[PDB]
Amino acid sequence: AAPESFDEVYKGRRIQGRPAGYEVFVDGVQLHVMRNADGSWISVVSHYDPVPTPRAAARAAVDELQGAPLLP
Amino acid sequence: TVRKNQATLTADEKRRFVAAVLELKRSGRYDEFVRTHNEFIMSDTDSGERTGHRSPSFLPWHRRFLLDFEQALQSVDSSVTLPYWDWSADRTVRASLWAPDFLGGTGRSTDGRVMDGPFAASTGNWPINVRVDSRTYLRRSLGGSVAELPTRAEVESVLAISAYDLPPYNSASEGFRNHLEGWRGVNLHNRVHVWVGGQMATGVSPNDPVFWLHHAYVDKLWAEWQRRHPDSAYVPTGGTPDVVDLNETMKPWNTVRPADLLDHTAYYTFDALEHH
Ligand SMILES: [Cu+2]
Ligand SMILES: [Cu+2]
Ligand SMILES: [Cu+2]
Ligand SMILES: [Cu+2]
């Protein structure tokens, strides 16, 4: 089973996650994310840095972006 | 055909490497390397087909990718070769690597923008075109997201691992390849990406020219491991789903196998590499 969905405002931005095998959005723009064998996650803007969950990867992407719109 | 420690380059060698990189950028060729790497990193998965990362072919794939880039550099200036960055030694922001005459320094703290060196956005010579967000300037935060580069002792512990790779041949594996890549253990290659920050922490990490120097040293460490373990070789050696076996060819080239890339001396030597 995939992780649960989530939806929150983090540092002023809307981050959403949902099983699809899992999708993350930052202000409605899809963020590429991937699950590692051990259960951790990364995103395309943090692709060498495992974090425990997809919400953690979304939050890490908001931290990385420093307010920048994500590109599809 | 000799790859040198970046710390040892002469002023003239630094000038020529910078100029060749910037000409590949100007002509459009550089950005396609960025794009190839991002496509593989977004597709290489632990549970499916994996070729450039999180798999045994991580090492020969980056070897051939670096050879492609070096060949392209040499088409602009045949004297240029890829230098390597020994991050176990040159581990501070003060390393001449990060001088304005070479790669430029860390980014400012407001937006991570690199403000000096030949690749600073203000030069007009380094637009970030292949990207995951709107920002079009080179960014770094040296030592921002992780405090320390690997140390020589940590490197030696990885080099002491005798098996090249082990099932399941992915980010959960024991063995040299995955400890070198960094997904298990004290973490060598992945942690350097995280330490530089900016685009080097992302799928489009070749946007920072230090990508090449990092991977040239990772590639050197593979060579050093081979010298310490003459009795160990690439695995798997046949019939493994989703993974490139020794004699299978690798995408995107389709015409070369890990077997064709184990011996770097066919293509280049290092300034220094000890004998077993
Ligand atoms: Cu990915
Ligand atoms: Cu890579
Ligand atoms: Cu890398
Ligand atoms: Cu011996």
3-state class (DSSP) for residue A65: helix
Q: State CA B267 to chain mean position distance.
A: 17
Please check whether residue B162 is in contact with residue B179, taking contact to mean a CB–CB distance below 8 angstroms.
no
Distance of CA B183 to the CA centre of its chain: 15
Find the ligand nearest to A22 CA: 1
Q: Is A12 helix (H, G, I), strand (E, B) or coil?
A: coil
Chain A, chain B: beta-carbon pairs less than 8 Å apart: 68
Annotated binding-site positions of A: 32, 34, 47-48
Q: Whose CA is closest to A47, among B171, B100, B56?
A: B171
Alpha-carbon gap: B93 to the closest alpha carbon of chain A (Å): 21
Mutating which of B132, B146, B207, B210 best tests the A interface, going by the most A Cβ atoms within 10 A?
B132
State both tokens at B21: 């990189």
Contacting B residues, span 136-175, partner chain A, CB-CB under 8 Å: 145, 168, 170-172
Contact B198, B114 (CB under 8 A): yes
90-109 in B: which are within 8 Å (CB) of A?
none
CA distance B236 to B138: 38
Ligand nearest to the CA of A57: 1
> Three-state SS for A35?
strand
The candidate with the shortest Cα–Cα distance to A55, out of A20, A7, A2, is A7
CA atoms of B59 and B219, how far apart (whole Å): 7
Q: Who contacts A35 (Cβ-Cβ below 8 Å, separation ≥6)?
A: A21, A22, A41, B46
Spatial neighbors of B247 by CB under 8 A, at least 6 apart, are: B237, B238, B257, B258, B259
Cα–Cα distances in angstroms (integers) from residue B111 to residues A53, A63, A66, in the given order? 26, 11, 7
**What is d(CA A7, CA A12) in angstroms, rounded to the nearest whole number?**
13
Q: A-chain residues within 8 Å CB-CB of B131?
A: 71
**How far does residue B211's CA lie from ligand 2's centre (Å)?**
9
Dist. CA B138–CA B94, nearest whole Å: 19
How far apart (Å, rounded) are the C-alpha atoms in residues A40 and A61? 15
Tell me the ligand closest to B231's alpha carbon.
Answer: 4
Tokens of B92: 């501070």
Between the CA of B220 and the centroid of ligand 4 the distance, in Å, is 19
**Domain map of chain A by residue range?**
5-66
In sequence order, the β-bridge partners of residue A7 are A16
Token look-up 């290489």 returns: B44
Closest-CA distance, B128 to chain A, in angstroms, reads: 13
Q: How far apart are CA A26 and CA B46, in angstroms?
A: 25
Rounded distance between C-alpha atoms, residue B237 and residue B255, angstroms: 18
User: Can you read off the two tokens belonging to residue A5?
Assistant: 């969905």
Residue A67 has a CB neighbour count (10 Å cut-off) of: 12
Taking the Cβ of residue B131 and every Cβ of chain A, the question of whether any pair is shorter than 8 Å is answered with yes
Residue pair A30/A72 in contact (Cβ under 8 Å)? The answer is: yes
What stretch of H or E contains A26? strand A22-26
Annotated binding site of B for Cu(+): 37, 53, 62, 189, 193, 215
Q: Name chain B contacts of A36, Cβ cutoff 8 Å.
A: 46, 54, 171-172, 183
Domain count, chain B: 1
Resolution (A): 1.4
Tell me which residue range forms the domain holding B128: 1-276
Strand-pairing partners, residue A35, are A41
| Beta pairing partners, A19 | A22
CATH number of the domain to which B218 belongs: 1.10.1280.10
User: Do residues B56 and B46 touch, judged by C-beta distance below 8 A?
Assistant: no
Q: Yes or no: say if B163 and B176 are a contact pair by the CB < 8 Å rule.
A: yes
| The total number of residues written for chain B in this structure | 276
Task: For residues B194 and B197, give the distance between their C-alpha atoms in angstroms, rounded to a whole number.
Answer: 5
Q: Are A65 and B170 inside 8 Å of each other by CB?
A: no
Integer CA distances (angstroms), B76 to B82, B126, B212, in order: 13, 17, 17
φ, ψ (nearest 5 deg) of residue B174: -80, 180
Residue among B128, B97, B93, B134 nearest B199 (CA): B128
- Nearest of B57, B84, B56 to residue B70 by alpha carbon: B84
How far is it, in rounded angstroms, from Cα B248 to Cα B236?
Answer: 10
A38: closest CA of chain B, how far (Å): 7
Strand, coil or helix: A31: strand
- Tokens (6 digits) for B212: 């090449």
CB-based contact B201 A70, cutoff 8 Å = no
Ligand nearest to the CA of B228: 4
Fold adopted by A5-66:
protein ne1242 fold (3.30.1880)
**How would you write chain B as a 3-class SS string?**
CEECEHHHCCHHHHHHHHHHHHHHHHHCHHHHHHHHHHHHHHHCCCCCCCCCCCCCCHHHHHHHHHHHHHHHHHHHCCCCCCCECCCCCCCCCCCHHHCCCCCCCCECCCCCEECCCCCCHHHCCCCCCCCCECCCCCECCCCCCCCCCCCHHHHHHHHCCCCCCCCCCCCCCCCHHHHHHCCCCCCCHHHHHHHHCHHHHCCCHHHCCHHHHHHHHHHHHHHHHHHHCCCCCCCCCCCCCCCCCCCCCCCCCCCCCHHHCCCHHHCCEECCCCCC
Task: Give chain A positions within 8 Å (CB) of B46.
Answer: 35-37
Contact B134 A36 (CB under 8 A): no
Of A37, A49, A69, the CB nearest to B134: A69
